[PDB]
Amino acid sequence: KNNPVLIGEPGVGKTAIVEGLAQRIINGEVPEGLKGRRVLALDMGALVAGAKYRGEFEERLKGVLNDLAKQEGNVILFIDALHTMVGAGMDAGNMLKPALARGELHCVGATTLDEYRQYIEKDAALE
Amino acid sequence: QALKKYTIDLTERAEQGKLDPVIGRDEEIRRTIQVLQRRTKNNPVLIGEPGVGKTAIVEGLAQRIINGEVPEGLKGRRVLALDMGALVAGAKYRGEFEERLKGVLNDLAKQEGNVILFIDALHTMVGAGMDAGNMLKPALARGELHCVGATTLDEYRQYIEKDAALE
Amino acid sequence: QALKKYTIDLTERAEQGKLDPVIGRDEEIRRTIQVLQRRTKNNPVLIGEPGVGKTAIVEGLAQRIINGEVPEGLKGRRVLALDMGALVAGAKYRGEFEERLKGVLNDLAKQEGNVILFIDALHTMVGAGMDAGNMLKPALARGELHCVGATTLDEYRQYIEKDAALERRFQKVFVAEPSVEDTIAILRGLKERYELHHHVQITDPAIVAAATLSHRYIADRQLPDKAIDLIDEAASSIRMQIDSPEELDRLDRRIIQLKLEQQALMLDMLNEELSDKERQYSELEEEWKAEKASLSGTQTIKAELEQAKIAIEQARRVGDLARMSELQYGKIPELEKQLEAATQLEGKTMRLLRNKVTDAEIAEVLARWTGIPVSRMMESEREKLLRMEQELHHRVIGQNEAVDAVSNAIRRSRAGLADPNRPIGSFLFLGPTGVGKTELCKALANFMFDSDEAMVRIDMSEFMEKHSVSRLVGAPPGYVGYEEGGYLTEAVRRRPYSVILLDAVEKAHPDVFNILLQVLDDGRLTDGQGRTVDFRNTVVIMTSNLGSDLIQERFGELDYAHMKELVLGVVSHNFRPEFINRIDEVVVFHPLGEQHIASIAQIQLKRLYKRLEERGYEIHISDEALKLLSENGYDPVYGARPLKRAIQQQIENPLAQQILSGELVPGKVIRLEVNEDRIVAVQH
Amino acid sequence: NRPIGSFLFLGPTGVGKTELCKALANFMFDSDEAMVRIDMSEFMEKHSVSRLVGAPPGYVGYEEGGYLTEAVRRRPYSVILLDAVEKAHPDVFNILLQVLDDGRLTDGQGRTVDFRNTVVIMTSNLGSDLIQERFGELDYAHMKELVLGVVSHNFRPEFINRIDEVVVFHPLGEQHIASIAQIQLKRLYKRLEERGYEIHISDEALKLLSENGYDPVYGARPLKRAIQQQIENPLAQQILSGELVPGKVIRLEVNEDRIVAVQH
Amino acid sequence: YLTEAVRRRPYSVILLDAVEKAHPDVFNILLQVLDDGRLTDGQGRTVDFRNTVVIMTSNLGSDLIQ
Ligand SMILES: Nc1ncnc2c1ncn2[C@@H]1O[C@H](COP(=O)(O)OP(=O)(O)OP(O)(O)=S)[C@@H](O)[C@H]1O
Ligand SMILES: Nc1ncnc2c1ncn2[C@@H]1O[C@H](COP(=O)(O)OP(=O)(O)OP(O)(O)=S)[C@@H](O)[C@H]1O
Ligand SMILES: Nc1ncnc2c1ncn2[C@@H]1O[C@H](COP(=O)(O)OP(=O)(O)O)[C@@H](O)[C@H]1O
Ligand SMILES: Nc1ncnc2c1ncn2[C@@H]1O[C@H](COP(=O)(O)OP(=O)(O)O)[C@@H](O)[C@H]1O
């Protein structure tokens, strides 16, 4: 269970708390295992803005996932709107599924209260 | 092959010790070994409130397969964990998902009644897009598949008790 | 194509022998072929409550098409199993459903009636998001399709008798449940099938007992599906107990424990003990391998026997001359006699247990389902019935006559001499109030099936109105309790093997006796919701007090016979002749004596010492305190509940107050010494 | 345009009213409860009329129909039995006015169910007192006349005009009671031979049964429970005693005041 | 009022204010409470009371207090 998801009502500063975690990474108030990590927010927009062909979107997304496996867990990934993330293109988040609870992928969730009850605890395959 | 593409071998992970030492649950593994060896109703579904390790009950069954602590007919089975999520959306065509699942089912016909299949959240097998129910409703009665379901009571009471050609 | 994409070619499967050769069902196959050889409306539907083998009727029809018992209007026909779920679940869009279904109808009309279309679960076709009825309708009318439905009767009358056009497109073939003997014959064919799979044997007494006790007890599922459930589940339990060995596991744990002990000690003696236990383990292991080899040879020779039977059916289809006589006269009797030689060999050698499913296995499986003492009088319940007087006087002191009567009643019932439409036994408890009416009720519910909790007590004193009657039977439709259930009938339908205990039926309204007339007449009490309630497994007991003063004032120097006749006359003045006419055996209670009161006090001391020893105290009592309790707890008007509240107020209130005061110490002998008016506890 | 019959079985209780109708069902469909039995002591108020026909549209029990019309729309040919037709309220049988008149009955959903093939039998015990008092020294015709006058005091003359025939049951006589005992012993023999035993009786035991079950006021059930007790208690007592061995003739011989079974 | 609230809330405390204005059937109900706590309504639901606290009031000895 190496993937915290944030559950809050919409507009209580979830992205703010993730960026505060990022500043404490920069300021060095964290334990030594997190000193030197990289916080990357996944751009949804520029991926879609040039897509035309069969899975070339997911080709780019899988290339980013292979680069994250190349970075060997030294990069703490953060993708907000997690209920939107599960379907965004095998589609967008269950490509990821074996890499999550193995020390490879550490995507940090941050999503709404009701949409947690929609698309996360019902979808028990990743629960 | 497609088993390398879309399944998770539990027996290789327990073979290399990646899984967990399952403690207790002798009675439920007993009942599973009963229901796995019948001639009809040959597919259990592990039913309880979620997060009680139904996946790990199947995994401990796989560990007892590796450690030889099963009855004789199970000595030599292969437990495979088919993901509902791994299969979905490589498809722009009109049913490439169905093509890949058909290739998987032909591979399990090729393995000749040996591979025991694992699926959790079996309601996703019912409705996910023919998608996974009626492509397998033949194979859930033609003896080419020995699926082990895992779901909560609510999805069993709705999406399985109703469907009388699955019930 | 389309037909290979969606349907399941059943004739190819029956040609590959993957089906069940279902014995019997000759009239339903005849009536299905009568329907299928018409000109218009060629569409039989197979209707019955689920489990009865409507799918098996269609498969047996396909096997008769393959073998050729059909007339000359079905030979060469293919039978195709359309899957209604496999056409709906792709349609996201406008008119992709009808794309598939028109593809299916064009390919079947290209076959030109050569393909009997088979549709299981036909009530999926109607309401499935206009959809599927209104394309099949011009083909089902003109007979150019050959649909065969398969549906439950409830879904039939709900999803088809509604829509009358698709009602007349089809034709009914009413399929009934098989008989008990037909269930036995079916299971004999299926025994000959199943002993190829589970590697075991089945003894035909277990088959007939399985069918009979499944028909007797499992009242939700129906034949033959429930009998096949029992047989297969016992076969799987025995397939467990092939490799369940326990003694090898005990010997292996023993040798590894003594191995660890001897390796830690390195006086010895344990090399010798370990060598003896390893020799015993090796002998048991080799015996286990010998049993496994015997069962393997038996399974292989049984499989060769069944393949020989399939091959002589191949010779019956094809028509080779010497192959028939050769396969029959050689292969059948020698393989059967050495199959029985392997059977008696396994009876000799199975020390490590069973490969033959006996009736006890069926009893264990059905007990895991429900928990009835399923089998017959097994000399544990039978000797309980032979000492049923003693068993009832284990908990109920006194009242010998009613104990004898109730004992005789259940002895009549369990031997099968009751009139099997009536309930097990009607009873009219009379006499003094509160002696053990309820204690005999609890004891009877206890030594009938489980305990005191398999009963329903109903205070009949509360029912004194017309709408009270409409409560306890159930409110008629269009009214109130029809929403929220009946009272008595729901309590029986939750607890089908129970005891109904009324309370002061004379205090009820003077019409509830008529509901009881229906009860004691035939034990069907059709509720408000219009479904029958079956009393034939229960025991109805009624309590009263119409001669309590009559019995208490005249018990001196009057026997049981004059008392019974006198109270029969008095009850005839109170009640109606029909009501007492329906009774099996009116019993008569007698008042209590003080030795019986002392015995009740003894049983209360037993249960209280049990509860306080669970609490952790060792308490003794003087018999003078027992005499004070007996004198302070009896009256002619109330009986033994004065003794109960006297025990409560004089022990359970003050002594537990002395315990909660930090006075008493657990473990000490606590003699309940007497006072002038009370009972004092000491610490010795 | 009527049902096959429509009857009104009167008389004192337990003279064979219900078993005549069960005798019909065992002739016609070869089964005892192969019939429809409307136990009319539940219908003591008019909302139970709404039970039997089915609840109207816009109410609770709409989506199920009645019980009667559902029963007969399944089986068009049956024997509809209405036992105890005067414990019920006097205005219940107006449903049966329509039934006996034309064989059509309208349920809740609005479908007329065809009663042109059934037999409506209503078994009363209104005339019990008058028949028990005056069946001596009176013929059959004036007895039927006078008890029919009593029924006319109970009912309205709409309904009894529909009836195909009212019959009158006479109270039982002693040789009839002996034959009742013989019939009960025959079916006891049948059920115990299915249990697997060889059981006979002495006629003296039958005489002692007839001398321990006679009463004109109660008809036949004291004979039935006398047979029940004074045969089945020592018989099943020796069954559970294990004294009975199959393959042995069992003559139910007399005791001094009882009946004993023997092993011979 | 009384029975169905325990079926809604089996985990609570019960009050019966102004019990001086009662009726003997209520006294029978409360003796059934103080005996075992099990009590069934008119339509067949067995309801347990032993996990609660029951409190009553009166206002005549209260007037003696005043
Ligand atoms: N601890 C904090 N310190 C400073 N500013 C904060 C803090 N928490 C919240 N805020 C402010 O509140 C804003 C909320 O931003 P978001 O995290 O995007 O809101 P949200 O709760 O994430 O809702 P969404 O889903 O992002 S629209 C931040 O951008 C800050 O301006
Ligand atoms: N005459 C028969 N001989 C052998 N097996 C039979 C026979 N009738 C039924 N069965 C078995 O009963 C099982 C299912 O019976 P069915 O009557 O097919 O139940 P069903 O048709 O599925 O009913 P539903 O409504 O679909 S649940 C199968 O294993 C059949 O082999
Ligand atoms: N035998 C066991 N001993 C200890 N923990 C177990 C055991 N089996 C399962 N678990 C725990 O259960 C968790 C898995 O929950 P699971 O039952 O698979 O999910 P679901 O809620 O979908 O049924 C694992 O984290 C595992 O640690
Ligand atoms: N014969 C007996 N043997 C043992 N205990 C009995 C006996 N008779 C009565 N009791 C006790 O006497 C009490 C009688 O109460 P109950 O049976 O409810 O009243 P009633 O006698 O009016 O039916 C029961 O609570 C029971 O504990």
- Which chain D positions have a beta carbon within 8 Å of C167's beta carbon? none
Q: Judging by DSSP bridges, how do beta strands C426-429 and C149-151 pair with one another?
A: unpaired
**SS3 annotation, C339-365:** HHHHHHHHHHHCCCCCCEECHHHHHHH
Q: Give yes or no for residue C438 CB within 6 A of ligand 4.
A: yes
Q: What are phi and psi of C119, to 5 degrees?
A: -125, 115
From CA D99, how far away is CA D164, in angstroms rounded? Answer: 12
* Cα A13 to middle of ligand 1, angstroms: 3
Q: Which of C173, C159, C145 minimizes the C-alpha distance to C41?
A: C145
> Peptide bond before C71: cis, by omega within 30 degrees of 0?
no
The encoded tokens of residue C202 equal 């089945």
Given a contact cutoff of 8 angstroms between Cβ atoms, the answer to whether C48 and C173 are in contact is no
Which residues touch D146 (CB under 8 Å, ≥6 apart)?
D130, D134
Q: Which of E5, E21, E22 minimizes the C-alpha distance to E49?
A: E5
| Geometric angle at alpha carbon C522, from C517 and C525, rounded to 5° | 70
* Cα A12 to middle of ligand 1, angstroms: 6
Q: Which of A37, A22, A46 minimizes the C-alpha distance to A71?
A: A37
Residue C588, by phi and psi: left (phi above 0), alpha (psi -120 to 50) or beta? Answer: beta
Min Cα separation B44/chain C (Å): 13
Q: What are phi and psi of C500, to 5 degrees?
A: -95, 120
The encoded tokens of residue C548 equal 């309590």
Q: How far apart are the first and last CA of chain D?
A: 62
Determine contact: C453 vs chain E, CB below 8 A: no
Distances in Å between the Cα of C463 and the Cα atoms of C116, C431, C455, C469, C473 are 62, 22, 19, 7, 12
For residue C470, the one-letter residue type is: S
Which residues touch B110 (CB under 8 Å, ≥6 apart)?
none
From CA D208, how far away is CA C44, in angstroms rounded? Answer: 61
From CA C285, how far away is CA C305, in angstroms rounded? Answer: 30
Sign of the Cα pseudo-torsion (D66, D69, D72, D78, in order): positive
* Eight-class DSSP state of C590: -
The encoded tokens of residue C93 equal 């869009």
From CA E29, how far away is CA A92, in angstroms rounded? Answer: 63
Given a contact cutoff of 8 angstroms between Cβ atoms, the answer to whether C36 and C71 are in contact is no
* Cα C195 to middle of ligand 2, angstroms: 19
Q: Which of D49, D92, D38, D191 minimizes the C-alpha distance to C522?
A: D38
Contact at CB, A127 and B90, closer than 8 angstroms: no
Which residues touch C591 (CB under 8 Å, ≥6 apart)?
C431, C432, C435, C551, C552, C555, C636
Q: Which residues pair with C475 in a beta bridge?
A: none
Given a contact cutoff of 8 angstroms between Cβ atoms, the answer to whether D37 and D83 are in contact is yes
Q: Which of C207, C175, C176, C205 minimizes the C-alpha distance to C189?
A: C207
Given a contact cutoff of 8 angstroms between Cβ atoms, the answer to whether D92 and D146 are in contact is no
* Cα A10 to middle of ligand 1, angstroms: 9
Q: How many residue pairs from chains C and E have C-beta atoms closer than 8 A?
A: 12
Q: Which residues pair with A76 in a beta bridge?
A: A39
CB neighbours of residue D242 within 10 Å: 11
Distances in Å between the Cα of D120 and the Cα atoms of D27, D37, D97, D98, D117 are 17, 10, 11, 12, 10
From CA C498, how far away is CA C519, in angstroms rounded? Answer: 14
For residue C495, the one-letter residue type is: R
Q: Judging by DSSP bridges, how do beta strands B78-82 and B149-151 pair with one another?
A: unpaired
Contact at CB, D191 and C524, closer than 8 angstroms: no
- Which chain C positions have a beta carbon within 8 Å of D84's beta carbon? 514, 517
**Among the bound ligands, the one closest to the CA of E35:** 4
The encoded tokens of residue C624 equal 């003078």
Given a contact cutoff of 8 angstroms between Cβ atoms, the answer to whether C372 and C265 are in contact is no
The encoded tokens of residue C372 equal 């009835």
From CA C603, how far away is CA C630, in angstroms rounded? Answer: 13
Q: Helices in C319-331 by DSSP H: which ranges? A: 321-326
The encoded tokens of residue C463 equal 């029912």
* Cα C92 to middle of ligand 4, angstroms: 70
How does DSSP assign chain D, residue by residue? ---SEEEEE-SSTTSSHHHHHHHHHHHHSSSTT-SEE--TTS--STHHHHHHH-PPTTSGGGGG--SHHHHHHH-SS-EEEEE-TTTS-SSSTHHHHHHHHHSEEE-TTS-EEE-SS-EEEEE--TTHHHHHHHSTT--HHHHHHHHHHHHHHHS-TTTTTS-SEEE-PPPP-HHHHHHHHHHHHHHHHHHHHHHT-EEEE-HHHHHHHHTTS--TTTTTHHHHHHHHHHHHHHHHHHHHTT---TT-EEEEEE-SSSEE----
Q: Which of C401, C431, C442, C393 minimizes the C-alpha distance to C636?
A: C431
Contact at CB, B130 and C197, closer than 8 angstroms: no
D60-63 long-range Cβ contacts below 8 angstroms, 24+ apart: D60/C477, D60/C478, D60/C479, D60/C482, D60/C483, D61/C476, D61/C477, D61/C478, D61/C482, D61/C529, D61/D108, D62/C477, D62/C478, D62/D108, D62/D109
- Which chain B positions have a beta carbon within 8 Å of A125's beta carbon? 83-85, 120-121, 124
CB neighbours of residue C458 within 10 Å: 20
How does DSSP assign E20-56, residue by residue? GG--HHHHHHHHHHHHT--EE-TT--EE--TTS-EEE
CB neighbours of residue C590 within 10 Å: 20
Which chains touch C (3+ CB pairs under 8 A)? Answer: B, D, E
From CA C394, how far away is CA C95, in angstroms rounded? Answer: 76
- Which residues in chain A precede a discontinuity of more than 2.5 Å between C and N? 89
Q: Which of D64, B139, B162 minimizes the C-alpha distance to C123?
A: B162
Atom of ligand 3 nearest to the CA of B57: 8
Cα D242 to chain center, whole Å? Answer: 37
**Among the bound ligands, the one closest to the CA of C433:** 4
Q: Which residues pair with D7 in a beta bridge?
A: D121, D165
- Name residue, tokens 């011009």: C138
Torsion of CA C219, C222, C228, C230, to 10 degrees: 0
**Among the bound ligands, the one closest to the CA of C461:** 4
Q: Which of D13, D45, D60 to mutate to test the interface with C (most CBs of C within 10 A)?
A: D60
From CA C586, how far away is CA C542, in angstroms rounded? Answer: 10
The encoded tokens of residue D99 equal 């039934």
The encoded tokens of residue D137 equal 């020294």
**H-helix or E-strand spanning residue A39:** strand A38-41
Determine contact: A58 vs chain B, CB below 8 A: yes
Contact at CB, C415 and D41, closer than 8 angstroms: no
Distances in Å between the Cα of C22 and the Cα atoms of B38, C56, C200, C201, C244 are 19, 7, 21, 20, 34
Q: How was this structure determined?
A: cryo-EM
For residue C532, the one-letter residue type is: T
Of all protein residues, the one whose alpha carbon is nearest to atom 27 of ligand 3 is B53
Torsion of CA C100, C108, C152, C154, to 10 degrees: 70
Distances in Å between the Cα of C414 and the Cα atoms of C454, C495, C585 are 18, 19, 17
- Which chain E positions have a beta carbon within 8 Å of C487's beta carbon? 42-44
From CA D62, how far away is CA C455, in angstroms rounded? Answer: 34
The encoded tokens of residue C590 equal 């007698």
Of all protein residues, the one whose alpha carbon is nearest to atom 12 of ligand 3 is B53
From CA A61, how far away is CA A95, in angstroms rounded? Answer: 9
Q: Collapsing DSSP states into helix, strand and coil, what is residue C168? A: helix
Of all protein residues, the one whose alpha carbon is nearest to atom 10 of ligand 4 is C436
| Geometric angle at alpha carbon B146, from B143 and B152, rounded to 5° | 135
Distances in Å between the Cα of C277 and the Cα atoms of C250, C281, C472 are 11, 6, 69
Given a contact cutoff of 8 angstroms between Cβ atoms, the answer to whether B36 and B143 are in contact is no
Q: Collapsing DSSP states into helix, strand and coil, what is residue C524? A: strand
The encoded tokens of residue C386 equal 């032979």
Q: Which residues of E20-55 are buried (b: 16+ CB within 10 A; e: fewer)?
A: eeeeeeeeeebeebeeeeebeeeebeebebeebeee
Helix D203-210 to helix D221-240 angle, to the nearest 10 degrees? 130
Q: Give yes or no for residue C56 CB within 6 A of ligand 4.
A: no
* Cα D84 to middle of ligand 3, angstroms: 64
Distances in Å between the Cα of B93 and the Cα atoms of A55, B98, B124 are 11, 10, 21
How does DSSP assign C220-283, residue by residue? SS-TTHHHHHHHHHHHHHHHHHH---HHHHHHHHHHHHHHHHHHHH----HHHHHHHHHHHHHH
Q: Which of D191, D189, D138 minimizes the C-alpha distance to D168?
A: D138
Q: Which of D17, D203, D7, D199 minimizes the C-alpha distance to D119?
A: D7
Interface of C with D in 479-518 (CB under 8 A): 479, 482-483, 511, 514-515, 517-518
Given a contact cutoff of 8 angstroms between Cβ atoms, the answer to whether C362 and C372 are in contact is no
- Name residue, tokens 């009384």: E2
User: For chain B, percent helix, then strand, then coil, each to nearest 5?
Assistant: 40, 10, 50
Which chains touch A (3+ CB pairs under 8 A)? Answer: B
Given a contact cutoff of 8 angstroms between Cβ atoms, the answer to whether A50 and A83 are in contact is no
Given a contact cutoff of 8 angstroms between Cβ atoms, the answer to whether D135 and D10 are in contact is no
From CA C426, how far away is CA C536, in angstroms rounded? Answer: 11
From CA C410, how far away is CA C389, in angstroms rounded? Answer: 12
From CA B34, how far away is CA C146, in angstroms rounded? Answer: 41
Helix D174-195 to helix D203-210 angle, to the nearest 10 degrees? 130
Query: Alpha-carbon Rg of chain D, whole angstroms?
Result: 23
Q: Which residues of D3-31 are buried (b: 16+ CB within 10 A; e: fewer)?
A: beebbbbbbbbbbbbbeebbebbeeeeee
The encoded tokens of residue D22 equal 């069960």
Q: Judging by DSSP bridges, how do beta strands D119-123 and D112-114 pair with one another?
A: unpaired
Q: Give yes or no for residue B103 CB within 6 A of ligand 3.
A: no
Q: Which of C342, C340, C337 minimizes the C-alpha distance to C295?
A: C342
From CA C164, how far away is CA C183, in angstroms rounded? Answer: 36
Q: Give yes or no for residue C45 CB within 6 A of ligand 4.
A: no
The encoded tokens of residue C244 equal 């369940």
Min Cα separation C667/chain B (Å): 37
Q: How far apart are the first and last CA of chain C?
A: 96
Q: Which residues of B41-71 are buried (b: 16+ CB within 10 A; e: fewer)?
A: ebbbbbbeebeebbbbbbbbbbbbbbeeebb
User: In C18-121, where do the E strands start and end?
Assistant: 44-47, 78-82, 115-119
Of all protein residues, the one whose alpha carbon is nearest to atom 24 of ligand 2 is C50
Q: Which of C389, C478, C490 minimizes the C-alpha distance to C440?
A: C389
**H-helix or E-strand spanning residue C670:** strand C669-674
Torsion of CA C291, C296, C297, C303, to 10 degrees: 150
From CA C264, how far away is CA C139, in angstroms rounded? Answer: 85
Contact at CB, C386 and D241, closer than 8 angstroms: yes
From CA E20, how far away is CA E56, in angstroms rounded? Answer: 9
Given a contact cutoff of 8 angstroms between Cβ atoms, the answer to whether B44 and B149 are in contact is yes
Given a contact cutoff of 8 angstroms between Cβ atoms, the answer to whether C594 and C630 are in contact is yes
